[PDB]
Design a protein around this ligand. Structure first.
Ligand SMILES: O=C(O)c1cc(=O)[nH]c(=O)[nH]1
Ligand SMILES: [Cl-]
Length: 311
């Protein structure tokens, strides 16, 4: 009775998709079989811009998108692209993500033609390249692919590197053919997309967050009885802790595979981490405010207040 086609970019093997399958099963049972989610991975329904427009228009009922692709439709959510924003402690990050701060980000979608019903962690990003990236000076003049975010372009600019937005489904080929030197992603994404076949170097950095937003077409959402709306939200929240543990463990598994495949892996040096943060924050925050305006200032303030309380 209430079928929803929900698309996303990732391999079906990864924790987001597995979690969405679990959500689908539980929602179908808890709604007397009436709400049926069908999940389409791997850009099957389009690249993320196409899926986002599809959800807004209602050609598809939903998408799970990284925040990094949503700043055109919703500049406010791009705060989540700022490097080194989240605490290292995952539980404290969750207090931010699931508390007043994250709630304000979900609410910001209402006026923009999406119903954002939940946000899930979905890993932290690491640098890869075909040129050495062992020191901060090494990044100068290199080019990196980013997700479709002006904030992420500024991230790389802050350390003298260039960045261009390329669709995820084209990324393997882009790396293979030297369209860019490098990219950034969680280790298990690097593994499942086989970016180790086309990148020689990896820096374990966790310098920025990959943040998932669960978006429904508003008319679809509104067509659902209230009790089903509540069941869906609660089910996403119920499945979340298992998804995060699967995602954390997948990074460990992925690192072993990446090292075995012959990628040179180094940790981000502490002084390089601090220097990156100090250079990247002003530029990425200014970019965020430039596009989000006063509402972005409001979210920065709310983040600072909640971070101080929590951390
Ligand atoms: O475009 C990407 O890099 C990307 C998208 C996505 O949904 N998940 C991910 O890990 N990376
Ligand atoms: Cl894409």
């Amino acid at each position: 009775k209430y079928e929803a086609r929900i698309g996303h970019l990732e391999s079906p093997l990864q924790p987001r998709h597995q979690g969405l399958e679990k959500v689908a099963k539980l929602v179908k049972e808890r709604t007397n079989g009436e709400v049926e989610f069908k999940i389409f991975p791997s850009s099957q329904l389009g690249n993320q811009r196409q899926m986002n427009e599809g959800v807004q228009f209602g050609t598809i009922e939903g998408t799970v998108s990284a925040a990094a692709f949503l700043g055109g439709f919703n500049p406010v959510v791009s705060i989540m692209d700022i490097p080194f924003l989240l605490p290292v402690d995952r539980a404290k990050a969750q207090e931010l993500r699931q508390g007043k701060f994250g709630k304000a980000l979900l609410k910001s979608f209402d006026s923009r033609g999406f119903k954002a019903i939940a946000t899930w962690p979905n890993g932290r990003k690491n640098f890869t390249s075909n040129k050495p990236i062992s020191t901060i000076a090494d990044y100068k003049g290199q080019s990196f692919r980013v997700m479709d975010s002006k904030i992420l372009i500024e991230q790389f600019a802050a350390i003298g590197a260039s960045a261009i937005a390329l669709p995820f489904g084209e990324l393997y080929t882009a790396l293979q053919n030297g369209v860019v030197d490098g990219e950034e992603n969680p280790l298990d994404t690097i593994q499942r997309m086989k970016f180790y076949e086309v990148q020689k170097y990896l820096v374990t950095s966790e310098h920025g967050a990959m943040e998932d937003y669960v978006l429904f077409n508003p008319s679809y959402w509104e067509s659902l009885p209230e009790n089903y709306q509540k069941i869906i939200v609660d089910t996403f929240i119920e499945v979340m802790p298992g998804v995060e543990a699967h995602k954390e463990q997948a990074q460990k598994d992925a690192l072993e595979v990446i090292k075995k495949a012959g990628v040179q892996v180094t940790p981000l040096q502490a002084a390089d981490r601090a220097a990156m943060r100090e250079l990247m924050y002003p530029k990425t925050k200014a970019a965020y405010l430039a596009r989000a305006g006063a509402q972005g200032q409001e979210l920065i303030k709310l983040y600072e207040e909640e971070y101080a309380r929590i951390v």
